[PDB]
Amino acid sequence: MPYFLLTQAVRTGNLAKFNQVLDQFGEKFQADGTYTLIIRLRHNVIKTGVRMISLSYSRISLADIAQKLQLDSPEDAEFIVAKAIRDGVIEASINHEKGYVQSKEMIDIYSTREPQLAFHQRISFCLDIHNMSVKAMRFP
Amino acid sequence: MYEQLKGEWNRKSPNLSKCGEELGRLKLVLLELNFLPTTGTKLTKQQLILARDILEIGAQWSILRKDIPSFERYMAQLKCYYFDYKEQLPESAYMHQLLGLNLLFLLSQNRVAEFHTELERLPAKDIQTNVYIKHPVSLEQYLMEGSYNKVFLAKGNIPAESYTFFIDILLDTIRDEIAGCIEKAYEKILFTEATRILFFNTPKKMTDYAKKRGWVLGPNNYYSFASQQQKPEDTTIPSTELAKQVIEYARQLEMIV
Amino acid sequence: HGLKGLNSKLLDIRSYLEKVATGKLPINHQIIYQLQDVFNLLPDVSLQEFVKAFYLKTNDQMVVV
Secondary structure (H helix, E strand, O other): OOOHHHHHHHHOOOOHHHHHHHHHOHHHHHHOOOOOOOOOOHHHHHHHHHHHHHHHOOEEEHHHHHHHOOOOOOOOHHHHHHHHHHHOOOOOEEEOOOOEEEOOOOOOOOOOOHHHHHHHHHHHHHHHHHHHHHHHHOOO | OOOOOOOOOOOOOOOOHHHHHHHHHHHHHHHHOOOOOOOOOHHHHHHHHHHHHHHHHHHHHHHHOOOHHHHHHHHHHHHHHHOOOOOOOOOOOOHHHHHHHHHHHHHHOOOHHHHHHHOOOOOOOOOOOOHHHHHHHHHHHHHHHOOHHHHHHOOOOOOOOOOHHHHHHHHHHHHHHHHHHHOOOOOOOOHHHHHHOOOOOOOOHHHHHHHHOOOOOOOOOOOOOOOOOOOOOOOOHHHHHHHHHHHHHHHHOOOOO | OOOHHHHHHHHHHHHHHHHHHHOOOOOOHHHHHHHHHHHOOOOOOOOOOOHHHHHHHHHHHHHHO
């Protein structure tokens, strides 16, 4: 209940409820020992909204995202996405001509060694399960 | 013994003979007795009052004289003095000012890992009161949200001093990242893009980027150099290392023999 | 040892070639074009004919192992 109510307001872009959840359950959040969220969740809410847009959309204008994130400033919309690409929230690009924010390339996985990198982590790990299970089983 | 307690500190400190006399004062206190057991006995707590006071004024002298390796040095002497086993020695009013100087200096070093691991020794001194600690954690909150404008409007807002050596390193550690964020595959932009990405209406600062780096102002047009390479063609580097990965499988499908 | 006989042939080709690049024994035109179609008929792996199609059977055989 202090956490299902927490992740509800973290998911949406609502803050007045999120300040209500935090102020009401702040005594619980200090007692259990996780009061290191107070500085680390204002970053999360402002990056959740830009992550949801970049996952949904593919080519959005900076004026369109600035009004979508209730920010009322089309001059730091370039600054938010610049911090998003720098922190690695989404791989995108900003064309600083008229507001083009484009998405990635066409997704090809099975043709550029990517299944090999996932599988090579599996082969060497599961034979290590086998080598540990061989050197435990025999006794007199 | 009680040598130059409060000299020229209230008004100015232009002299450097004060520094060596304080240094001789830092000798004699450590020549008296060591602070290492630190159990009880208020008599030796009296010289712990004096030793922590002569370093806090030594920290104020160190930040005044533009000295970076000493300001971390005198603070580490004080922070090891705040680390006491049997903590006693009641509340000095310069403590909350001193941690604000350390934490803002740590924010200026680009130490985001050390910034948060320090913030445990203050239970409720971050939200209710103590604007000296509240001002960096409001500032760090501004860097994580993404509002550069809120950073510099609060730059002219300090409780005690001007925070001059702290904001200038803060001015340094932002713009190189802003220069690091704009040096990309971008070819050219006009002056009005550097009016928004960068700042003020034609200072000597754009000369500094023109004399150090490129960004040559020509016919009202900047020119940022940019290129890209091309590499999907190399199956050869996943030829050698894949042949190693396939054999080290078959090396290990046997050999516990 | 399938490859130990490979370079033993390849050392033998240049040994006769440097013997005739010097010019001690006279040439045979018969072996020249018989050697020349070796070098302009080896494959060259560039793009979309190998690097696509090689992973299509390499990421295939990594599923069954």
